[PDB]
Amino acid sequence: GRPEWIWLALGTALMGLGTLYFLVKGMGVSDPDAKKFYAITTLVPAIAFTMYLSMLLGYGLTMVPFGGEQNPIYWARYADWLFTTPLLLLDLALLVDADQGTILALVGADGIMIGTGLVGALTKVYSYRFVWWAISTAAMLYILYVLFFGFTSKAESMRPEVASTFKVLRNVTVVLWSAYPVVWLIGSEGAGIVPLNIETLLFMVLDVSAKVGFGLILLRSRAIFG
Numbered sequence: 001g002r003p004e005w006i007w008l009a010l011g012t013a014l015m016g017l018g019t020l021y022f023l024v025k026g027m028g029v030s031d032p033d034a035k036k037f038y039a040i041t042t043l044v045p046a047i048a049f050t051m052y053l054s055m056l057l058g059y060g061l062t063m064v065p066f067g068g069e070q071n072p073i074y075w076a077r078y079a080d081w082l083f084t085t086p087l088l089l090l091d092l093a094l095l096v097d098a099d100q101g102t103i104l105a106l107v108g109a110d111g112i113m114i115g116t117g118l119v120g121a122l123t124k125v126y127s128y129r130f131v132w133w134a135i136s137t138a139a140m141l142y143i144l145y146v147l148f149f150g151f152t153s154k155a156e157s158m159r160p161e162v163a164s165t166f167k168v169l170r171n172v173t174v175v176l177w178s179a180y181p182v183v184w185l186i187g188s189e190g191a192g193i194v195p196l197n198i199e200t201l202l203f204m205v206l207d208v209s210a211k212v213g214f215g216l217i218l219l220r221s222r223a224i225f226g
């Protein structure tokens with residue numbers, strides 16, 4: 001009955017509800033272009049659901065030795081993020097009709113973010129934890145650079161409802177993604193300052209907002225209709 005359980009339970013509920021709602025809504029859409037966004041965006045909280053549920057049940061948790069202590073690390077988060085973060089970038093890329101090469105590069109930079117963040121979460125040499133964290137944060141900053149300079153630029157050729165929706169999602173994304181590396185740095189994977197219960201509450205708010213909040217905004221806009 002670990003104290004962070006409550007936040008995993010509430011994350012499981014919120015992700016489950018969001019998945020359902022988005023499914024119900026997506027089932028009623030016939031527009032070809034809109035259906036693709038629904039599929040992708042319903043899949044995202046679905047995957048987060050399974051991983052929050054897993055973590056609630058005590059899977060995806062391992063102890064890593066570093067700084068003279070056994071430290072609890074939820075690796076299940078990375079299995080979620082490995083698929084969900086590129087799917088959220090895909091939403092944004094299809095919105096602004098980004099080029100296939102840009103999408104490859106993003107997904108590739110995202111895989112590297114997640115994978116190097118994983119390696120760092122599992123690293124036993126304390127200082128090497130932060131080498132992997134820095135490389136991960138670099139890859140995240142490449143992504144955000146691309147969203148902000150590349151996509152915004154592209155979105156500016158599009159219809160106003162597309163440009164407006166993109167900007168909102170881009171802003172939500174940059175604010176919430178940028179908070180992840182900070183939480184990791186001060187939390188249990190990092191400096192150990194913020195306790196695991198509070199850290200789990202923080203990832204909860206950020207994940208729900210970055211998937212369900214993002215989703216509500218995207219799927220209720222007129223921008224997804226071709």
Ligand SMILES: *C/C=C(C)/C=C/C=C(C)/C=C/C1=C(C)CCCC1(C)C
Pocket residue numbers: 081084085088113114116117118132133136137138140177178180181184207210211
């Ligand atoms: C839906 C879940 C989302 C949108 C999660 C996004 C997560 C990140 C942007 C995490 C980034 C990380 C780094 C910048 C550095 C090292 C650790 C990570 C994986 C937490």
Ligand SMILES: CCCCCCCCCC
Pocket residue numbers: 036039040094
């Ligand atoms: C289930 C994921 C479906 C997303 C399709 C996106 C295709 C890109 C344009 C052809």
Ligand SMILES: CCCCCCCCCC
Pocket residue numbers: 101102104105106108109142
């Ligand atoms: C244009 C296609 C790029 C191929 C993958 C490169 C990923 C490197 C991270 C910048």
Ligand SMILES: CCCCCCCCCC
Pocket residue numbers: 138139141142145
């Ligand atoms: C450490 C910060 C890394 C920033 C990457 C620069 C983006 C590439 C522009 C083409």
Ligand SMILES: CCCCCCCCCC
Pocket residue numbers: 141142144145148174
């Ligand atoms: C050129 C170095 C890139 C690092 C900055 C990332 C900017 C994020 C845009 C919101």
Ligand SMILES: CCCCCCCCCC
Pocket residue numbers: 167168171172175176
């Ligand atoms: C255009 C403004 C979009 C909203 C971004 C604010 C995110 C706040 C996170 C708590």
Ligand SMILES: CCCCCCCC
Pocket residue numbers: 131
């Ligand atoms: C302790 C040495 C840091 C290694 C640099 C990481 C990029 C290759």
Ligand SMILES: CCCCCCCC
Pocket residue numbers: 137177178179181182185
């Ligand atoms: C969004 C990540 C910013 C770069 C590291 C910030 C650590 C305070």
